[PDB]
């Protein structure tokens, strides 16, 4: 595995060059954004983002070393979290707004169009304002996002084999490398040791909030599946049920 042999700088550049593009939605400002069209737009957007995410994940150092069954599992667990941290990162420079797409910028007053969504909107806004306060760096964000991929389903594995634990062990060695990378970045920005450990902890605690937002979001999503989404996003919701 080359992932454990990457220097910190190579790790950052690998992650930066794998960044997916920022996709546009088919939002028509003249059309009245009803509740049905609002979710239509969000759903079409996420479905196209999933294709890019799957090819992004292949380029995360260490990911392709895992079995295909494990790759599937990690992505099934983490896809909404990954969508959400991307959303929150593109939204940093837009206080009080969520930039779902360069042409879809929303405040909390929208999304009340969709019942139960304004609470999650509020939480995504507060995460975005938190990243703004910390002045999160792009090199730190791609580390965080890679940590979500490798971490969110690492304790939900079947792991029926002693060798299925050896798969968990490699994921932890990669996670440790990314921690090393984050610390490297903070020392280079002039932070002291105490400041490095403090910032490192602050960023990882925000991941617990991202897990919370995704779980609440997922709960509403496979409840909305009951009410009257495409095939890939259908199998993704079904995984959390």
């Amino acid at each position: 595995s080359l992932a454990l042999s990457l220097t910190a700088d190579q790790m950052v550049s690998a992650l930066l060059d794998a960044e997916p593009p920022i996709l546009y939605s088919e939002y028509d400002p003249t059309r009245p954004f009803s509740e049905a069209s609002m979710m239509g737009l969000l759903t079409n957007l996420a479905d196209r983002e999933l294709v890019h995410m799957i090819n992004w994940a292949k380029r995360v150092p260490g990911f392709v070393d895992l079995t295909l069954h494990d790759q599937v599992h990690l992505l099934e667990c983490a896809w909404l979290e990954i969508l959400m941290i991307g959303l929150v990162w593109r939204s940093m420079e837009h206080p009080g707004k969520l930039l779902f797409a360069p042409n879809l910028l929303l405040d909390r007053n929208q999304g009340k169009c969709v019942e139960g969504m304004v609470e999650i909107f509020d939480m995504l806004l507060a995460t975005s304002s938190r990243f703004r306060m910390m002045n999160l760096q792009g090199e730190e964000f791609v580390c965080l996002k890679s940590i979500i991929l490798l971490n969110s389903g690492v304790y939900t594995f079947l792991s029926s084999t002693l060798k299925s634990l050896e798969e968990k062990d490699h994921i932890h060695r990669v996670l440790d490398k990314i921690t090393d990378t984050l610390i490297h970045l903070m020392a280079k920005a002039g932070l002291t040791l105490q400041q490095q450990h403090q910032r490192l902890a602050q960023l990882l605690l925000i991941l617990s909030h991202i897990r919370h937002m995704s779980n609440k979001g997922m709960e509403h999503l496979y409840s909305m599946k009951c009410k009257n989404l495409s095939d890939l996003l259908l199998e993704m919701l079904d995984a959390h049920r």
């Binding site: 799957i54 295909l68 790759q71």
Partner: peptide
Amino acid sequence: HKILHRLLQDS
């Protein structure tokens, strides 16, 4: 084989 499984596999 689900969709995600195929897309991960496309070489």
